[PDB]
Design a protein around this ligand. Structure first.
Ligand SMILES: CC1(C)CCC(C)(C)c2cc(C(=O)Nc3ccc(C(=O)O)cc3)ccc21
Ligand SMILES: CC1(C)CCC(C)(C)c2cc(C(=O)Nc3ccc(C(=O)O)cc3)ccc21
Lengths: 233, 26, 233, 26
């Protein structure tokens, strides 16, 4: 029963988020040495790639058992509130420590300075620190999918019409992750609570992400893409 | 909301998806 | 065996620095209890004074935590500044009276939702009151409130820590103590649900850091020296 | 910074804490 839930969540994450193994990297060299307020160019690709991964997050949510049984209002509410969490967790899972870079789903591989100029700004060091904090957890697709599924199906989100049903769906996910951690890494004693503590870091960063969006609007040349604008605020 | 909605009520289809992606992009 | 006594040290540390709703003589005020204002100056003055004193109480609590004073002064300051709002928000939320929909400060000041808003909470009010309601089914006591306070404070994922691995060596015993304590009291999966409440808190306190900046514009003079010191970039 | 340092590196007493409280509140 719990093995099928783990298999379902892992499958859903693999189908909507390709591993770093399959992606061919490419690198840009502009805006890579000096920090600017915003490199218009990197922002154009960055916003386009985030819009596409937001779409992948909804596909991923629709494959999680029980999510489609919630009202559409609550699904929208959960997705808007977890959007930045899952995006940041995804890009931090694609961090290459030796290069100090992050790779997007199309293969775009940016260093720290380029991440800043693309739109991260003062969030840059926060995100790169979190990506380093994930390294000792040795996370695979199942653990990354389960973490995303737990952040998304959170019964404590505001405006939830049925918080109780959402909490009912989150409990099997948490015990699935606990069981999975016990079987994968029997050496690490307290790996399960430390993974949950990483969700606390992630929710802190993405709360500061919702703040960066406000200042990004006045700096970009135009206005935010439609889907991003709907998800945030 | 608007776009978000259709993504959730997606008789899903690469054509539908392509349309929503362009709308999502702008 | 260390685990059984760590619980009592953190419970005793919390009880000395935070009088429970049990031993507090409530009192109320009538001004600004019906209409929502941008900021009631009289409530803001009492609220900021009471906040400064509970910050001092948090420092006192931190100093009783096993191992906290063995960290460098720079790290102690860094941990305290990063967890200050979390512990403040957690403390006032554990003084929430559900039937009255009120919160009681350490001197007995008991405010309703509108007064909490007018005192400085502003757009945070519904977030804080929702969290205090989500704490209710947990039936928290002084040991649990102190343990989650300690866990939030002794966090080696904070930025600019000099010895993060040492901090994290101190947090793992605190996590084991809470895990054992909730197994001894008695919902059947209490331990992961309490850790998830930390994710909510941290998210709330990050939004609190933004509210501080907006508050500085709306308050008459300046922020008290200690608060301005704890909450600065 | 200036007051948090003295509250931490503090030999306890009610008189010294009363002074740091006064500086903390302004
Ligand atoms: C809050 C801020 C700065 C402004 C608004 C947007 C642009 C939404 C954003 C997006 C992310 C993010 O993580 N985007 C990702 C884009 C592509 C992939 C992938 O290809 O796997 C993964 C993640 C982080 C911060 C922000
Ligand atoms: C972020 C925001 C709005 C602006 C800056 C300050 C004023 C620091 C603040 C303080 C709290 C808070 O919880 N203060 C407490 C005051 C007294 C007691 C007690 O007596 O136990 C407990 C808590 C919440 C939000 C904020």
């Amino acid at each position: 029963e719990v093995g099928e839930l783990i298999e379902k969540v892992r499958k859903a994450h693999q189908e909507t988020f390709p591993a770093l193994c399959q992606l061919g990297k490419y690198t840009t060299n502009n805006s890579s040495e000096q920090r600017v307020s915003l490199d218009i160019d990197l922002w154009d690709k960055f916003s386009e790639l985030s819009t596409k991964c937001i779409i992948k997050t909804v596909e991923f949510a629709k494959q999680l058992p029980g999510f489609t049984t919630l009202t559409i209002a609550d699904q929208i509410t959960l997705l808007k509130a977890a959007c930045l969490d899952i995006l940041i967790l995804r890009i931090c899972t694609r961090y290459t420590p030796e290069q100090d870079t992050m790779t997007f789903s199309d293969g775009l591989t940016l260093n720290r300075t380029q991440m800043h100029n693309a739109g991260f700004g003062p969030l840059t060091d926060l995100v790169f620190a979190f990506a380093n904090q994930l390294l000792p957890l040795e996370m695979d697709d199942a653990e990354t999918g389960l973490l995303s599924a737990i952040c998304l199906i959170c019964g404590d989100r505001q405006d939830l019409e049925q918080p109780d049903r959402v909490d009912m769906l989150q409990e099997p996910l948490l015990e699935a992750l606990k069981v999975y951690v016990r079987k994968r890494r029997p050496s690490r004693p307290h790996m399960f609570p430390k993974m949950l503590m990483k969700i606390t870091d992630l929710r802190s960063i993405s709360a500061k992400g919702a703040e960066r969006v406000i200042t990004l609007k006045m700096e970009i040349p135009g206005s935010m893409p439609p889907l991003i604008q709907e998800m945030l605020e | 909301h608007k776009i978000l909605h259709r993504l959730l009520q997606d008789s899903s289809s690469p054509v539908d998806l392509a349309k929503l992606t362009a709308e999502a992009t702008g």
